[PDB]
Amino acid sequence: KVFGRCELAAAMKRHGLDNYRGYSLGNWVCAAKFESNFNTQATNRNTDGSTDYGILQINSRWWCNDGRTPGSRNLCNIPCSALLSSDITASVNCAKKIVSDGNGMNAWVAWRNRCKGTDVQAWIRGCRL
Ligand SMILES: [Cl-]
Ligand SMILES: [Cl-]
Ligand code: NA
Structure with missing residues (x-):
């Protein structure tokens, strides 16, 4: 599923x-x-052999099991394919564990490089929430 901006918010x-x-x-x-x-269906492979999954690109080296990342942990205790659902519950639940682990949202490189320190409230402007 490709979300609209306000729909996802x-x-x-x-x-x-x-x-x-x-x-x-x-x-x-x-x-x-x-x-x-x-x-929600986005996937990207990393150089170390792990893969990022879903709307928040959660990484198989630490957070989910995809059966092909040897030595990986599965800290969200979920198969990575569950992160590709049109229902974002599993991605959100896992993201809550990631953002709590001490490094905040710096775990997301695109957030660090493209969101951190910008006017992020613009992303929800005009939405009925
Ligand atoms: Cl980036
Ligand atoms: Cl905001
Ligand atoms: Na894993």
Whole structure:
């Protein structure tokens, strides 16, 4: 599923991400825009052999099992394919564990490089929330 900007914002709000660990909703929408272009089916392979999955590009080296990342942990205890669903619940639940692990949203390179320190509230402007 390719989300609309306000559709995704409303969905993330309903799943408890607004101000989760202090990160306003616009941060999460901005990260999803630049990680996946709002596409729940996005996948990208990394040089180390791991793969990033879904709307928030969650990585198989640490967070999900895809059966082909040897020595990987599965800290969200989920198959990576569950992160590609049109239902974002599994991606959101896993992201809550990632953002809590001490490094905040710096775990998302596109957030660090394209959202951090910008006017992220623009990402939810005009949305009915
Ligand atoms: Cl915001
Ligand atoms: Cl980047
Ligand atoms: Na894994």
